[PDB]
Coordinates of C-alpha atoms (C1' of nucleotides) and ligand atoms in Angstrom, one line a residue:
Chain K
X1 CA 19.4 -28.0 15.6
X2 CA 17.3 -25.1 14.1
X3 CA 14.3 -27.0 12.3
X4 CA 12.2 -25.0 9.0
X5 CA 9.4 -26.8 8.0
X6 CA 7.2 -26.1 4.8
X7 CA 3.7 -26.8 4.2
X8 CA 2.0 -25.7 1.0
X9 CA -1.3 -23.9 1.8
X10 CA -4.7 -25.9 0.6
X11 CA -2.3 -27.3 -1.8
X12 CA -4.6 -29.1 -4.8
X13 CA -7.2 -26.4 -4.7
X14 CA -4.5 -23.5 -4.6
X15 CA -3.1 -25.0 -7.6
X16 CA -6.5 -25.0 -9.3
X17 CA -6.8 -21.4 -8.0
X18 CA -2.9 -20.7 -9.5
X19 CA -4.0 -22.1 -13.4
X20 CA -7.5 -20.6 -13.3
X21 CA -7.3 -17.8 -11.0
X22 CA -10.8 -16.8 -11.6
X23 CA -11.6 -19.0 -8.8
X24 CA -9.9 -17.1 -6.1
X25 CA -11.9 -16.1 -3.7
X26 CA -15.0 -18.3 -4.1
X27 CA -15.0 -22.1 -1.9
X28 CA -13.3 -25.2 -4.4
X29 CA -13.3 -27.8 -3.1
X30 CA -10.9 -30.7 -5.2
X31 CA -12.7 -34.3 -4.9
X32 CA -11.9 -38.2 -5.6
X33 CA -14.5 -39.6 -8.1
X34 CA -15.4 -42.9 -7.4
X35 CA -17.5 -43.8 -10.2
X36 CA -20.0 -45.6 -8.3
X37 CA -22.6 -43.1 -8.5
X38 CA -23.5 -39.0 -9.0
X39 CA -20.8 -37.9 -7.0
X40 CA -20.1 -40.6 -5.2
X41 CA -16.7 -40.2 -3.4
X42 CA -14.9 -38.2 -1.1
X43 CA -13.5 -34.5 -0.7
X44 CA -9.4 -34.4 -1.4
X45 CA -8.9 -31.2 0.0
X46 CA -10.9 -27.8 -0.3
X47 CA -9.5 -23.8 0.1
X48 CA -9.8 -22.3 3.4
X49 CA -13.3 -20.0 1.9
X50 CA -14.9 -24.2 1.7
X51 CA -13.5 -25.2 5.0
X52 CA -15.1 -22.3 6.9
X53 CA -18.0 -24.1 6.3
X54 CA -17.6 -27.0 7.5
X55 CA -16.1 -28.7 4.0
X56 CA -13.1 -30.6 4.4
X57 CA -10.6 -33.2 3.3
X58 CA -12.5 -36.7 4.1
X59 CA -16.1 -36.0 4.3
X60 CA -17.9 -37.7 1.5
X61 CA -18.8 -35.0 -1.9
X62 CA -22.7 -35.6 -1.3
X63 CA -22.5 -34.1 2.2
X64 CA -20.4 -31.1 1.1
X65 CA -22.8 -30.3 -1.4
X66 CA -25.5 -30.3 0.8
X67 CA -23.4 -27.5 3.0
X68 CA -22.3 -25.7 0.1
X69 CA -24.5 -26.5 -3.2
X70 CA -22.6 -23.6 -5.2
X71 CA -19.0 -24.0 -4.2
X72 CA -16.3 -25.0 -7.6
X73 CA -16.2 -28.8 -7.1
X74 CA -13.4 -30.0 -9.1
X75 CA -11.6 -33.8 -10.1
X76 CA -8.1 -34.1 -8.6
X77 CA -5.5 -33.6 -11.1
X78 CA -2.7 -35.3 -9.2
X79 CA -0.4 -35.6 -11.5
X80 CA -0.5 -31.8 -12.4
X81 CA -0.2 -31.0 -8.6
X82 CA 2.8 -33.2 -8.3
X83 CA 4.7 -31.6 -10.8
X84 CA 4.0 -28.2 -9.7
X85 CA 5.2 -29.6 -6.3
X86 CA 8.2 -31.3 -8.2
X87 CA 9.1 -27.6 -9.2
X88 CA 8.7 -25.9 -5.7
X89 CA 10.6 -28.8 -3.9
X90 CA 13.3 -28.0 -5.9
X91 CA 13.5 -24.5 -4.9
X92 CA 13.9 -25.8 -1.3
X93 CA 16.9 -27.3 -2.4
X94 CA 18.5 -24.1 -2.5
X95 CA 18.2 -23.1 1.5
X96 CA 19.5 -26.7 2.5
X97 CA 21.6 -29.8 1.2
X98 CA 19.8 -31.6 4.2
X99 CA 15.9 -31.8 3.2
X100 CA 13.4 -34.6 4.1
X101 CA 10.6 -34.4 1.4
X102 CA 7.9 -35.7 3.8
X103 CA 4.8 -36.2 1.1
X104 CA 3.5 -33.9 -1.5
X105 CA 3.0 -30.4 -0.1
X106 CA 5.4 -30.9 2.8
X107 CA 9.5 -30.6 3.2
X108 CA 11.8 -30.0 6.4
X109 CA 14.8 -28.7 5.8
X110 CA 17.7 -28.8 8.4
X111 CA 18.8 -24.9 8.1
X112 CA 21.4 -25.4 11.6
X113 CA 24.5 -25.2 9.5
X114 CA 22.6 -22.1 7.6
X115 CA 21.6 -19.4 10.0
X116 CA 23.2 -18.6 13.6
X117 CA 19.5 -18.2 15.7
X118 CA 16.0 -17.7 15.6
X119 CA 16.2 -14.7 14.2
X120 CA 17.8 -15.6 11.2
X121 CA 15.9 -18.4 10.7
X122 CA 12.7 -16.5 10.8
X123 CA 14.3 -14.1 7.8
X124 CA 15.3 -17.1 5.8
X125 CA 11.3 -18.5 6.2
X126 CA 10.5 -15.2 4.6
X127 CA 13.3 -15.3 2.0
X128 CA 11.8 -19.1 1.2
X129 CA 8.2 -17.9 1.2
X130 CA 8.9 -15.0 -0.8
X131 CA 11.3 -17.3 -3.8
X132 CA 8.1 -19.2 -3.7
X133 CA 5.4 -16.9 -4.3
X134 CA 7.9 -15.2 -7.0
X135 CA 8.3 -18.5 -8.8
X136 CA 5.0 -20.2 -8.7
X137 CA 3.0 -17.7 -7.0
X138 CA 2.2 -20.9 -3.9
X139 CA 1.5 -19.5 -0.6
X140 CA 2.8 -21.7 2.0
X141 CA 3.2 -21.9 5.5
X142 CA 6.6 -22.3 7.8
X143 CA 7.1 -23.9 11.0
X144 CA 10.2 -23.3 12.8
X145 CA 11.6 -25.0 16.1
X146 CA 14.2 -26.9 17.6
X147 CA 12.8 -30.5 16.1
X148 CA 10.5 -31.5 13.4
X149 CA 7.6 -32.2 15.7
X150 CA 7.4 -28.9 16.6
X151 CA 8.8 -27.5 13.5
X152 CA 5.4 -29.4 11.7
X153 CA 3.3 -28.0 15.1
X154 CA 4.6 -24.2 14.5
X155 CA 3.1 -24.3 10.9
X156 CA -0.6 -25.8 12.0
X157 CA -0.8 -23.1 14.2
X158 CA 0.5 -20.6 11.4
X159 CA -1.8 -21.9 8.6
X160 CA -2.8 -20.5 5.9
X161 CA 0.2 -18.0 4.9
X162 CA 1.8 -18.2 7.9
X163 CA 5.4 -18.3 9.6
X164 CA 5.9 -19.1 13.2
X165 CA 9.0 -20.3 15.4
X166 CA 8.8 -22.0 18.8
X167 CA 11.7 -21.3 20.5
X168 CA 12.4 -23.3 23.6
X169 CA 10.8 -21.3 26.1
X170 CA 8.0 -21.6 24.2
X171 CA 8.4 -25.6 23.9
X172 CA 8.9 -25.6 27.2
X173 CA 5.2 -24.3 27.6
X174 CA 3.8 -26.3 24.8
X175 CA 4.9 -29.4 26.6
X176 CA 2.8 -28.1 29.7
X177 CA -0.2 -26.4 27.8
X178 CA -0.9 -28.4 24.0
X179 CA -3.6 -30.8 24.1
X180 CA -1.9 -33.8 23.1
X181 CA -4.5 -35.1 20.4
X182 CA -2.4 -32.4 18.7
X183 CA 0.9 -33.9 18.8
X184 CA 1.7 -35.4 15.2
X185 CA 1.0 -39.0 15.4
X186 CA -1.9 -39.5 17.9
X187 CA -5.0 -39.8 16.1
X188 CA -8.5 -40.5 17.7
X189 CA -8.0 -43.8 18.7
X190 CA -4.4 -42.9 20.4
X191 CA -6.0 -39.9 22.3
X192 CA -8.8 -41.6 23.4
X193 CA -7.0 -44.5 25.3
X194 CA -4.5 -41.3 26.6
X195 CA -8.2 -39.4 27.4
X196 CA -8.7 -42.5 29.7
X197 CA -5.6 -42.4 31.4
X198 CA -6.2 -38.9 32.7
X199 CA -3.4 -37.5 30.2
X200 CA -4.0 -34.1 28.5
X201 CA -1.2 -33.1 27.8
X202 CA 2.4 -33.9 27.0
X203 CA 3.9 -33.5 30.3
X204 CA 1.6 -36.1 32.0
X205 CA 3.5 -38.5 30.3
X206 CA 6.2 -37.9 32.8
X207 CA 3.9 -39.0 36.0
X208 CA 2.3 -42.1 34.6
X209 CA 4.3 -45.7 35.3
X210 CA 5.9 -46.3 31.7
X211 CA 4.5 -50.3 31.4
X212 CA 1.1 -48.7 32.2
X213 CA 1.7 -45.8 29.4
X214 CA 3.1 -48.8 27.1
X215 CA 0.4 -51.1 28.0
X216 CA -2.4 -48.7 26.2
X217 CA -0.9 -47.3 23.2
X218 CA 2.4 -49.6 23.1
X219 CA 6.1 -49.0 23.4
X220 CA 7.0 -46.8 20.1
X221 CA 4.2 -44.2 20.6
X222 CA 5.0 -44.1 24.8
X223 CA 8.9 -43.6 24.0
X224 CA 7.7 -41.2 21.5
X225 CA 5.4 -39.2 23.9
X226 CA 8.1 -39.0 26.7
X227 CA 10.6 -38.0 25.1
X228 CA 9.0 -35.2 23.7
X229 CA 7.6 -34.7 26.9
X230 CA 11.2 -34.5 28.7
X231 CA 12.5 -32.4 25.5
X232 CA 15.0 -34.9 24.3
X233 CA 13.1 -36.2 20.9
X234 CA 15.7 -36.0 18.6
X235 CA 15.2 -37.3 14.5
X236 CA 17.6 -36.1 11.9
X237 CA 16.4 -34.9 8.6
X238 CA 16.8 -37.6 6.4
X239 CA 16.4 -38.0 2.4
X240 CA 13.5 -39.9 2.2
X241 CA 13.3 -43.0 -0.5
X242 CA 10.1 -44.4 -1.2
X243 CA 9.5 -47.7 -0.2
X244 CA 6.3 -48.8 -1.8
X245 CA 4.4 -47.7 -4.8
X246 CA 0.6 -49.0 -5.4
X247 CA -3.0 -47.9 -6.9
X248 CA -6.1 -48.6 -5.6
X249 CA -9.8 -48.0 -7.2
X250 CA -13.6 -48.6 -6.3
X251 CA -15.7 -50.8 -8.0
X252 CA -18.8 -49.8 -9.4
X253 CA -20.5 -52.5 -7.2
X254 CA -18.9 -54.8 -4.5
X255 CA -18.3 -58.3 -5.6
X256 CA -16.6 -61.5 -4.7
X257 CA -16.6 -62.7 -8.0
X258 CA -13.1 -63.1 -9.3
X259 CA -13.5 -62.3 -13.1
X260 CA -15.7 -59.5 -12.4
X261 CA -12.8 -58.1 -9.7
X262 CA -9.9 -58.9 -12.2
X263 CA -10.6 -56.1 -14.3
X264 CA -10.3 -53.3 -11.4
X265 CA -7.1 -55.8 -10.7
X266 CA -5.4 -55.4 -13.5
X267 CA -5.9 -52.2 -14.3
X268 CA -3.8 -51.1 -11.2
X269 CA -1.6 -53.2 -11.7
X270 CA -1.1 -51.1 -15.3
X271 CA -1.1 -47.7 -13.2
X272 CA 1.5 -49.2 -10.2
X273 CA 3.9 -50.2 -13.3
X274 CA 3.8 -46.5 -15.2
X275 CA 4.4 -45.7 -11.6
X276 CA 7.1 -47.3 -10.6
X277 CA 9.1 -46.0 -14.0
X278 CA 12.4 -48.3 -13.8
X279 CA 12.1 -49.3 -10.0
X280 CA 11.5 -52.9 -10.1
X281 CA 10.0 -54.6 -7.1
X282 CA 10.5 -57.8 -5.1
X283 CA 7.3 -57.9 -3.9
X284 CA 3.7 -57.7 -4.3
X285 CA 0.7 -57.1 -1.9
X286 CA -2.9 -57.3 -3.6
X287 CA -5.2 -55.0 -1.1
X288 CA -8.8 -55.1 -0.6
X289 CA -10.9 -52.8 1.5
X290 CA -14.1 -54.9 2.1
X291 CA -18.0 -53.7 2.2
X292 CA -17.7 -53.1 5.8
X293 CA -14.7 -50.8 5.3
X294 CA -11.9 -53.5 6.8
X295 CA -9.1 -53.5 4.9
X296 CA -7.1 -57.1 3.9
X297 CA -4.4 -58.3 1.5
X298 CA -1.8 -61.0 0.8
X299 CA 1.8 -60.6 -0.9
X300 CA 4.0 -62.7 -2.1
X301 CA 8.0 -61.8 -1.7
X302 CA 10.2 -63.5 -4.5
X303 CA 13.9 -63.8 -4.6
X304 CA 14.3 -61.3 -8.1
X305 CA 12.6 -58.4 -9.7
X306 CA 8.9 -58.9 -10.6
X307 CA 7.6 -58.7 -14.3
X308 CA 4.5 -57.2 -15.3
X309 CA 3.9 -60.5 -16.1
X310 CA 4.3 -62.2 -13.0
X311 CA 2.6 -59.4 -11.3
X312 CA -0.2 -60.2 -13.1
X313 CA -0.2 -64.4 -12.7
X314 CA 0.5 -63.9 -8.5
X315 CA -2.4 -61.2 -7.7
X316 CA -4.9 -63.4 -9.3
X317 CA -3.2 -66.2 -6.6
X318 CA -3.1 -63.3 -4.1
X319 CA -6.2 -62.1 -4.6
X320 CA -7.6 -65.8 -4.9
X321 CA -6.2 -66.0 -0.9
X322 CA -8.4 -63.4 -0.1
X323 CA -11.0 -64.3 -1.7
X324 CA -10.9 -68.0 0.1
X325 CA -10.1 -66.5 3.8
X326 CA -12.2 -63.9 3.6
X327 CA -16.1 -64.1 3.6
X328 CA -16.6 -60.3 2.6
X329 CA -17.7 -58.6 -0.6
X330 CA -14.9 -56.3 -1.9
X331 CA -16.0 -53.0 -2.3
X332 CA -12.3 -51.6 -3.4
X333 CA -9.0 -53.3 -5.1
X334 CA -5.7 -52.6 -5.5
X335 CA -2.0 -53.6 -5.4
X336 CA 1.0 -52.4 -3.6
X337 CA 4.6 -53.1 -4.8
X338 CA 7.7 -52.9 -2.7
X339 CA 11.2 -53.9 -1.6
X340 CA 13.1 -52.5 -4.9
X341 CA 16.2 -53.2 -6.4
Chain W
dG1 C1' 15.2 -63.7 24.0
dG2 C1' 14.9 -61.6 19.9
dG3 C1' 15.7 -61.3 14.4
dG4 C1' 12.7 -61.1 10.5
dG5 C1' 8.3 -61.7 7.7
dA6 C1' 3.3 -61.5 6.9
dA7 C1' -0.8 -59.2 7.9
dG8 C1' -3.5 -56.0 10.6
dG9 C1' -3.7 -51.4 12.9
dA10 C1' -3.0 -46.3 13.3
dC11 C1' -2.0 -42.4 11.3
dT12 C1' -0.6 -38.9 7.8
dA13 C1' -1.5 -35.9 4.0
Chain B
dT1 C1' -26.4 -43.9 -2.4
dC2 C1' -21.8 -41.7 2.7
dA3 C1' -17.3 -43.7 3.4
dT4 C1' -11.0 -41.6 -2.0
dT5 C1' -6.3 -42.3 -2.5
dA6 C1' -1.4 -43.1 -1.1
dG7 C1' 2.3 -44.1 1.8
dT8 C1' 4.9 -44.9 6.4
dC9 C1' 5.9 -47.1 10.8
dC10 C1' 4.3 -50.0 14.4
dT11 C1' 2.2 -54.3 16.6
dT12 C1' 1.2 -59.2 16.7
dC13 C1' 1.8 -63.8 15.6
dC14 C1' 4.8 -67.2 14.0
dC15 C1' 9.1 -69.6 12.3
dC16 C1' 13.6 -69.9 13.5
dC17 C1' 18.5 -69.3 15.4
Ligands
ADI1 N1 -8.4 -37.2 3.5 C1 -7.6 -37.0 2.4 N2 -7.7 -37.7 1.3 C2 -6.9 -37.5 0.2 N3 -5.9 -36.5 0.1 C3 -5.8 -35.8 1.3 C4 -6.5 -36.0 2.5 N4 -6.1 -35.1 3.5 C5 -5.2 -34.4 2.9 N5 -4.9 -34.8 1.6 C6 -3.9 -34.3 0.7 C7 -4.4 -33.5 -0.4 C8 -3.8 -32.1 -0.4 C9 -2.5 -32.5 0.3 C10 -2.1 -31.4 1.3 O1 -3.3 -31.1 2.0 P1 -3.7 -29.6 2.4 O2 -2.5 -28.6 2.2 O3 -5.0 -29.3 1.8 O4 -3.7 -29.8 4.0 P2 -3.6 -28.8 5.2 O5 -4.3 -27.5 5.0 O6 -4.0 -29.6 6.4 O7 -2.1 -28.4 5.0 O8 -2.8 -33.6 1.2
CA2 CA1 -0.6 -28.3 3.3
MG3 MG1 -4.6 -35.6 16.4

DNA sequence: GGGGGAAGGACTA
DNA sequence: TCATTAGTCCTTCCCCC
């Protein structure tokens, strides 16, 4: 199998950058509002001239101001990135009937029944970044390999505006040489508990007695690791469907107080059903992210579709649950809907 | 023993 | 007053066959 990933460079900023161009070139960094306080929240995403100093996706807006007081700080307009992303996913379309829309700014694209080798693959990345750059003037990065794991690692090492392919020889090396805290799916907690087991890098998987691999980070992620390690991971492209649709939002102050949390409550519940546009949902999850950060919630599964209606009457119950099992102060709300017809 | 759900846990972008 | 938003797959605990 011959692997072409796409990811879209800086993606909300360079959109920004694409409708007011006057920005190009200076640090933008494109944050999440909370409404709590003067720029309370948190940093979406910024452009690589913001990131070179230390301001990045995750770190809260007050503490990227303090690095870079002058920088273009900017409200996330997702619904304008997502149909500019709409547009370029379906110029993917043309390379490959088999494509796998991972998330917004992200696609692989099976291209094995499309080109012969490397080679070919490599000119059709170019053809693809080019169509792109032509039509919506996107840079993007491409990732090329014999998988998607390393397809998706080709194009971290490529980014921004990149193209790279990993042929097997060079897999063969990465399995030896890439720190494994680099391997899609192992985040800090994974690679600390892999950290303590004296494994670095993907082939020390290979050494270690499976149950005591699986004992630490559990069966899926162990059987993931080796057989990546051994070179035999294998996942087809696949169409992907969504599977649950939900909004979440901060409250101006935490509170355990059920009318004052309703409010917040309901009004996601509003956004999840614009959302969902004709998809109608079996179940229904209220979420809470406490004071402390922890994150709970409850659903309820019913046997038919679920009304606006009824999605209002059960979070109040669901939320209610939490409420009575949980000793907490909510600092965020939010509902999540699922299993469609 | 293990299918399936609810809720938490990690991780991703 | 640091700490968003959204979605996916896995683990754990429990009921149940
Ligand atoms: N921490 C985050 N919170 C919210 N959105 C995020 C976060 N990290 C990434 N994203 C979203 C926003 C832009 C979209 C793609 O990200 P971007 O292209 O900037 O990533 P990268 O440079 O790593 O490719 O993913
Ligand atoms: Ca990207
Ligand atoms: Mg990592």
């Amino acid at each position: 199998m011959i692997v072409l990933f796409v990811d879209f460079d800086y993606f909300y900023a360079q959109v920004e950058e694409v409708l007011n161009p006057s920005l190009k070139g200076k640090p933008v960094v494109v944050c999440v509002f909370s409404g709590r306080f003067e720029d309370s929240g948190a940093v979406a995403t910024a452009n690589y001239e913001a990131r070179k100093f230390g301001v990045k996706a995750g770190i809260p807006i007050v503490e990227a101001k303090k690095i870079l007081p002058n920088a273009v700080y900017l409200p996330m307009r997702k619904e304008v990135y997502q149909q500019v992303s709409s547009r370029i996913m379906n110029l993917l379309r043309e390379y490959s009937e088999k494509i796998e829309i991972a998330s917004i700014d992200e696609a692989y694209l099976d291209i094995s029944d499309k080109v012969r080798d490397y080679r070919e693959a490599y000119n059709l990345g170019l053809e693809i970044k080019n169509k792109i750059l032509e039509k919506e003037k996107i840079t993007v990065t491409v990732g090329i390999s014999k998988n998607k794991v390393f397809a998706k690692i080709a194009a971290d090492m490529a980014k921004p505006n990149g193209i790279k392919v990993i042929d097997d020889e060079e897999v063969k090396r990465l399995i030896r040489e890439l720190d494994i805290a680099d391997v899609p799916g192992i985040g800090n907690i994974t690679a600390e508990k892999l950290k303590k087991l004296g494994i670095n890098k993907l082939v020390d998987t290979l050494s270690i007695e499976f149950d005591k691999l699986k004992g630490m980070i559990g069966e899926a992620k162990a059987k993931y690791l080796i057989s990546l390690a051994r070179d035999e991971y294998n996942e087809p492209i696949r169409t992907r469907v969504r599977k649950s649709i939900g909004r979440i939002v901060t409250m101006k102050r935490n509170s355990r107080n059920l009318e004052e949390i309703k409010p917040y409550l309901f009004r996601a519940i509003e956004e999840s059903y614009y959302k969902l546009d004709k998809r109608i949902p079996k179940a229904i999850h209220v979420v809470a992210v406490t004071e402390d950060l922890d994150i709970v919630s409850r659903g309820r599964t019913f046997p038919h579709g679920i009304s606006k209606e009824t999605a209002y009457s059960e979070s109040v119950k669901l939320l209610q649950k939490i409420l009575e099992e949980d000793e907490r102060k909510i600092r965020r709300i939010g509902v999540r809907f699922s299993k469609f017809i």
